[PDB]
Amino acid sequence: ADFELMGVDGKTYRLSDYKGKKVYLKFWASWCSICLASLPDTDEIAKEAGDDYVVLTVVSPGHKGEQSEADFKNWYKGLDYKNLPVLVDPSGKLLETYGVRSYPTQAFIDKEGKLVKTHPGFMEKDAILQTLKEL
Ligand SMILES: [Mg+2]
Ligand SMILES: [Mg+2]
Ligand SMILES: [Mg+2]
Ligand SMILES: [Mg+2]
Ligand SMILES: [Mg+2]
Ligand SMILES: [Mg+2]
Ligand SMILES: [Mg+2]
Ligand SMILES: [Mg+2]
Ligand SMILES: [Mg+2]
């Protein structure tokens, strides 16, 4: 199922934009210390993507204890990730769609936009990359 979300960067992202490419989607929240500790890995994976896959991240203001959208966008200015899209979903709908129960959750989507795998929790960078290769 398609989604359309705006990033903290003001860009509008649609899942269908990436038809033909594999997608790694990271679900996270500002309060999640493991999430924050791993964002540098996520940013590297995004930087290194080339034409192989696409990286997106998603926060959900007002859900699972996340800040409001306005407060989140301010807070995020304190962070420094030049290569990471941070899509904002104040509806909480993607959490439901992807069956996200905890943070972080790693989601892997195939070239047709169908969900192949989710993984709750920390995942090492090379394991994420290998998972993408196996799609
Ligand atoms: Mg836009
Ligand atoms: Mg917080
Ligand atoms: Mg925090
Ligand atoms: Mg701590
Ligand atoms: Mg989220
Ligand atoms: Mg949340
Ligand atoms: Mg709460
Ligand atoms: Mg909100
Ligand atoms: Mg910003």
Residue numbers in the entry: 53 to 187
Study text:
Surface-exposed Etrx1 and Etrx2 deliver electrons to the SpMsrAB2 protein for the reduction of MsrA2 (by Etrx1 or Etrx2) and MsrB2 (by Etrx2) domains.
The Etrx1 model comprises amino acid residues from Ala53 to Leu187. Besides the canonical Trx fold, Etrx1 has two insertions. The first insertion (residues 53–72) results in β1, β2 and α1 elements, and the second insertion (residues 112–144) gives rise to an additional β-strand (β5) and α-helix (α3). These cysteine residues form a disulphide bridge reflecting the oxidized state of the protein. Etrx1 lacks this cavity and this region shows differences in both the nature of the amino acids and in the conformation of the β4–α3 loop. In agreement with these results, soaking experiments with Etrx1 crystals did not yield a complex with Cyclofos-3™ even at high concentrations of the detergent.
